[PDB]
Design a protein around this ligand. Structure first.
Ligand SMILES: [Zn+2]
Length: 151
């Protein structure tokens, strides 16, 4: 749908609107990343793995390599302990979208990319109060970038 999407760099106190994903297949090899192009054929990885590490810190944000848009301010990530693609709050419903359900017996909302509803995952009420929701998302989308353009 020909909408445009806000991107609120909440933790950086910025707001930048960008268009929706409207390209042709030809764009997706010259305006994409030198990782998005390959990820575009392999849904992340041709081999089932390519290493075993996770050596990071709370800097950077997530950037959906599957449409080119950035989102989660990394306080809305984990890193230490397990760094999992699961979290307990969000940047905003700006480049991510939810629909509520009760699909565990409490609160199970879907979690999809509001510019590319490819897979991602869902959120489930499952953590300690107050931020006791538990988002988890599972796709190739999960590249990082520096927080915005500070690098
Ligand atoms: Zn996306």
């Amino acid at each position: 749908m020909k909408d445009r999407i806000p991107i609120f760099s909440v933790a950086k106190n910025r707001v930048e609107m960008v268009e929706r994903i409207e390209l042709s297949d030809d764009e997706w090899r010259e305006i994409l990343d030198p990782e998005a192009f390959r990820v575009a054929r392999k849904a992340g990885t041709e081999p089932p793995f390519t290493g075993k590490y996770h050596d990071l810190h709370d800097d950077g944000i997530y950037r959906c390599i599957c449409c080119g848009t950035d989102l989660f301010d990394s306080e809305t990530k984990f890193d230490s302990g397990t760094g999992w693609p699961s979290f307990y709050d969000v940047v905003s419903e700006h480049n991510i979208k939810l629909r509520e359900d009760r699909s565990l017996g409490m609160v199970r909302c879907e979690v999809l990319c509001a510019r590319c509803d490819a897979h991602l995952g869902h959120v489930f009420d499952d953590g300690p109060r107050p931020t006791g929701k538990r988002y988890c998302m599972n796709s190739a989308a999960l590249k990082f970038i520096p927080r915005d353009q500070i690098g």
